[PDB]
Swiss-Prot record:
It is found in: Nucleus, Nuclear pore complex; Nucleus membrane. Sequence repeats lie at residues 15-38. The chain holds residues 718 to 820 of 1337 of the full protein. Component of the nuclear pore complex (NPC). NPC constitutes the exclusive means of nucleocytoplasmic transport. NPCs allow the passive diffusion of ions and small molecules and the active, nuclear transport receptor-mediated bidirectional transport of macromolecules such as proteins, RNAs, ribonucleoparticles (RNPs), and ribosomal subunits across the nuclear envelope. Due to its 8-fold rotational symmetry, all subunits are present with 8 copies or multiples thereof. Interacts with NUP188. It comes from Saccharomyces cerevisiae (strain ATCC 204508 / S288c) (Baker's yeast). Functions as a component of the nuclear pore complex (NPC). NPC components, collectively referred to as nucleoporins (NUPs), can play the role of both NPC structural components and of docking or interaction partners for transiently associated nuclear transport factors. POM152 is important for the de novo assembly of NPCs. The N-terminus is blocked. Phosphorylated by CDC28. This is Nucleoporin POM152. Present with 3410 molecules/cell in log phase SD medium.
Length: 103
């Protein structure tokens, strides 16, 4: 039994322009086919984005965050992960920040 999760390698906020997307490298936790769910959430209000990649067997995967067509402030956090037996684990490990601006 393992406690799976994610540990982002991007160790600070990202400076983007408008219409920019980002790429946050994450050395993920949990060894085996895990369903990795994470939230790219806005601190701006509630445009919380959610992405789920099943059976991540990587433990070192750089994530590509969707294009931000508006300068704002976002945090990529971890929602939940899933063991290959179908066991969802509450993810609470380091998060990333994506700060988008308008050029």
């Amino acid at each position: 039994r393992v406690k799976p999760s994610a540990s982002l390698k991007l160790h600070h906020d990202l400076k983007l322009c408008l219409g920019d997307h980002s790429s946050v490298p994450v050395a993920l936790k949990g060894q085996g086919p895990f369903t990795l769910t994470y939230d790219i959430i806005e601190t701006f209000s509630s445009k919380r984005k959610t992405f789920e990649i099943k059976e991540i067997k990587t433990n070192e995967y750089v994530i590509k965050t969707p294009v931000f067509t508006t300068g704002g402030d976002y945090i990529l956090s971890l929602v939940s992960i899933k063991d290959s037996t179908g066991c969802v684990v509450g993810l609470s490990q380091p998060d990333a920040k994506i700060q988008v601006r308008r050029d």
